[PDB]
Design a protein around this ligand. Structure first.
Ligand code: HEM
Ligand code: HEM
Lengths: 361, 363
């Protein structure tokens, strides 16, 4: 299975969620606008090959023996695996190439939120590439080759491996986060065209014409205190979210997809504070992935949720909802340790178009 | 999605078909009570029976007393067994405890220092290890997480390593996976169907000198970083010369098919396959079962990439050690570096429902 690379929007936002994630933030090391635009065109050409299951350039072998292969070859024999490659532009990129007056107002800096413990090395970035696929080696291969093609012009600032469900699990079945709770029940679906136009896609009336058809991405590396969470009682765990753990139904209800009655939950339950009704209607497209990088020095599981949210405007999406989570009962068990925002440009229209063409011209 | 039988004369997860994901965890023992540690092995064995069958540990992930923490952490609820295997091993440092000194197998030999070693002592060693292999990473993480939670107060996680993809094959009938250098890895390994080769090279026999290890094996774990910047700027001929096989097909140099037998005299004298081939090491043969890993960036603008090398053998002294010694002149050494190491004695399998991990040692 493959996902079409071209379209009015970039794939990997409203398209079906893939099993694995390789998210990489890049810093730009060149000041030459012409050299960066040339890289964007080379990256788009490589992305077309990668999302179709082909090697980049002239291939991974069969070329001149004296030359290094254009493709590093670790994806040979694998399927496209629904690979999507989604590029975004960080705020720091607009301080380069004379783009200062073209930074959208919707690409706002995030305020400091209570409990933030952000790692500067795992935060920020001039640009990002979100690589989603059902095979993690397909996603890693894409990031590794894009970084190789960009060497000398970009460096990898930080990268994150993520996983969700293993589709080979019934789909429709809501996946569970590493806390044991169903995650994604009340979310914007890719089938909800109208809700995508209202809450996800940027329109030309929003004030930034080059972003029309694109979106804004908020990335948060949220560590979970697994060992602390696992010592809490089942009632404490269900009280934290407002949904039961077995079925995922809201409190007082029977089925997972029963619409919640917020007054029945505790006032600081996560769902009650994150619900659009508690936030002036602010609705988010959550497309995050669980992560487990290993164990820290104290033997604790370095695991959590790599939270990804797409929205029409950061000021009316993540910011008001995250601000409402200031008293979240979940805050006892999580800690945001990394953060980045990106303007995700519109999609590549056809074979002659390229990443970021509406911005650089 | 199916389950792998947990019981047997041997532990599963060695000759078993190699699953997609790996969660390897090394534990240190914090208790001096032998009876308490034996009770943990039985409690771990009961949990493994549930985990490998796709069932939650204990009384379940929910439905119990509201005021009590669930026995199962619950993040594997609604998932298939996903070919989950749990393989336990005992490190040499364990035998300094519980009066097990005289029971250390001679085949559980300390590895000598090899040229180029830069071993991080934090991510090395360990009293014991649990190799969790499954096609679903959430299933693998859930097993390690619940085993450690059951072991709270008696064991602590020393270090862990997650493998996002396999770089090995025990099933030559299936496509050989590729490592992060782009080459097929696992072409000439030991297959799970080759019973005679497994008895000769992998499983410990009673005549080897350690009766309680009969039916088990010996594991060598090596964390190997790859210099992918150095590798990616090397020419295709250089890359193929390093291994002795072409990159596209994986055939030995000069030959057409991956599984054609290597003609060692045609490769360079420092080629990896020529130096590691059993014919170059007095017949020494290994069961490789490693995985790729990438733990983010190196802080220098590059993806961190490596291979978590896992080797099972009948005797460390006659398996990994002579082969690794012969790789002293390996052309691959220019592109890799061993940064973590550990050896473990993998006990025999859990015979039936009454048996438990390590019962031949304790029991
Ligand atoms: C480790 C971090 C987090 C965990 C484990 C978590 C977990 C959950 C769970 C279990 C639900 C209920 C099931 C569902 O509808 O998805 C939920 C709902 C939701 N969460 Fe979170 N969450 C986390 C962080 C966040 C953050 C940082 C935000 C926004 C800033 C957020 C926004 C939402 C929203 C909007 C909903 C939908 C609520 C509704 O409309 O009913 N979550 N989350
Ligand atoms: C990053 C580290 C390594 C890489 C990338 C690597 C790669 C490869 C490749 C491409 C092959 C040829 C295909 C195959 O037969 O599997 C191979 C074969 C082999 N390797 Fe390695 N290897 C690594 C480390 C090691 C180590 C540390 C050992 C032993 C100490 C080892 C022992 C072997 C053996 C025994 C064979 C089979 C040779 C034969 O019988 O023809 N490898 N390896």
């Amino acid at each position: 299975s493959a996902v079409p690379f071209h379209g009015a929007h970039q794939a990997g936002i409203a398209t079906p969620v893939q099993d694995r994630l390789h998210f990489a933030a890049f810093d730009v090391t060149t000041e030459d606008r012409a050299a960066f635009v040339a890289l964007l065109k080379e990256w788009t050409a490589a992305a077309r090959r990668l999302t179709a299951g082909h090697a980049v350039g002239e291939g991974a072998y069969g070329g001149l023996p004296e030359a290094p292969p254009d493709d590093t070859g670790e994806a040979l024999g694998l399927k496209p695996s629904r690979l999507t490659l989604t590029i975004g532009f960080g705020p720091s990129l607009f301080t380069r190439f004379g783009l200062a007056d073209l930074r959208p107002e919707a690409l706002a800096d995030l305020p400091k939120f209570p409990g933030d413990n952000l790692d500067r090395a795992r935060s920020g970035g001039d640009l990002c590439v979100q690589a989603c696929a059902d095979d993690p080696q397909v996603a890693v291969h894409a990031i590794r080759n894009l970084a190789r093609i960009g060497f000398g012009k970009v460096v990898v600032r930080w990268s994150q491996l993520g996983f969700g469900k293993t589709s080979s699990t019934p789909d429709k079945q809501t996946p569970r986060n590493l806390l044991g709770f169903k995650d994604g029940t009340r979310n914007i679906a890719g089938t909800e065209k109208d809700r995508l136009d209202r809450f996800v896609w940027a329109a030309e009336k929003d004030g930034t014409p080059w972003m029309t058809g694109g979106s804004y991405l908020v990335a948060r590396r949220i560590r979970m205190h697994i060992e602390t969470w696992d010592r809490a009682s089942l009632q404490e765990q269900e009280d934290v979210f407002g949904r039961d753990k077995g079925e995922g139904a809201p409190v007082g209800k029977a089925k997972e997809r029963d619409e919640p009655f917020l007054k029945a939950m505790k006032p600081d339950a996560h769902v009650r504070l994150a619900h659009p009704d508690s936030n002036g209607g602010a609705t988010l497209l959550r497309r995050g992935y669980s992560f487990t990088d290993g164990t820290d020095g104290l033997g604790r599981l370095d695991a959590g949720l790599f939270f990804l949210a797409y929205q029409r405007d950061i000021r009316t999406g993540f910011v008001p909802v995250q601000r409402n989570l200031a008293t979240d009962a979940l805050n006892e068990f999580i800690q945001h340790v990394g953060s980045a925002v990106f303007a995700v440009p519109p999609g590549v229209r056809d074979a002659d178009d390229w990443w970021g063409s509406t911005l650089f011209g």
